[PDB]
Amino acid sequence: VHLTPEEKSAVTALWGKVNVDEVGGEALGRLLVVYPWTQRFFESFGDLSTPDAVMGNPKVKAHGKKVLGAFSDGLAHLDNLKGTFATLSELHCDKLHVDPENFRLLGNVLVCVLAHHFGKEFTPPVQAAYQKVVAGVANALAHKYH
């Protein structure tokens, strides 16, 4: 994660606004809804049958919240993402056995959510700025896969 200093301000200024509470679940939920096969890892979360049930599910907003903690975390440790995500990697990898392709999708829905909430502020340069981050995070987690 290189990130020109101007791409930094873009990512920085935008994030600090993010409703770190709601946004988390907004992503994870849409992941379960738009990419159904993901749901196979949260049967334990309760009813995930309709979208309305997934977006109202308390287990989802509670997990997405954490998931965003991992972002905010990595977002302030770009310099070294692998180490930051070393634990989570192993977990998602040799434990949960989640296909790394799914870490790109989640990151991609997150970028849709961020587009949904900041509409016009989320300009094309600010998107490509986050797009670097999402891949960056998405790769550190797929590390243990070597």
Partner 1 sequence: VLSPADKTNVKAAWGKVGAHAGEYGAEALERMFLSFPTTKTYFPHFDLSHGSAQVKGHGKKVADALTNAVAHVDDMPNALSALSDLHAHKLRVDPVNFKLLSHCLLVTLAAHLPAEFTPAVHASLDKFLASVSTVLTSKYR
Is residue 77 part of an annotated ligand binding site? no
Decide which of its own copies, ligand HEM, partner 1, none touches 128; Cβ closer than 5 to 8 Å per partner kind.
Answer: partner 1
Does residue 2 bind its own copies (CB under 8 A)? yes
> Of 8, 12, 37, 83, which lies in the binding site for partner 1, with binding defined by CB under 8 A?
37
Does residue 24 bind partner 1 (CB under 8 A)? no
> Of 24, 25, 64, 107, which lies in the binding site for ligand HEM, with binding defined by CB under 6 A?
107
Q: Between residues 75 and 93, which has the closer beta carbon with respect to partner 1?
A: 93
Q: How far apart are CB 47 and partner 1 at their closest, in Å?
A: 15
The Cα-based distances of 30 to 5, 20, 33, 68, 145 in angstroms read: 31, 16, 5, 14, 26
Q: How far apart are the first and last CA of the chain?
A: 20
Is residue 82 part of an annotated ligand binding site? yes
Does residue 142 bind ligand HEM (CB under 6 A)? no
Decide which of its own copies, ligand HEM, partner 1, none touches 23; Cβ closer than 5 to 8 Å per partner kind.
Answer: none
HEC secondary structure over the chain: CCCCHHHHHHHHHHHCCCCCCHHHHHHHHHHHHHCHHHHHHCHHHCCCCCHHHHCCCHHHHHHHHHHHHHHHHHCCCCCCHHHHCHHHHHHHCCCCCCCCHHHHHHHHHHHHHHHHHHCCCCCHHHHHHHHHHHHHHHHHHCHHHC
Does residue 70 bind ligand HEM (CB under 6 A)? yes
* Residues in the annotated binding site for heme b: 63, 92
Contacts with its own copies by CB under 8 A lie at 1-2, 132, 135-136, 139, 145-146
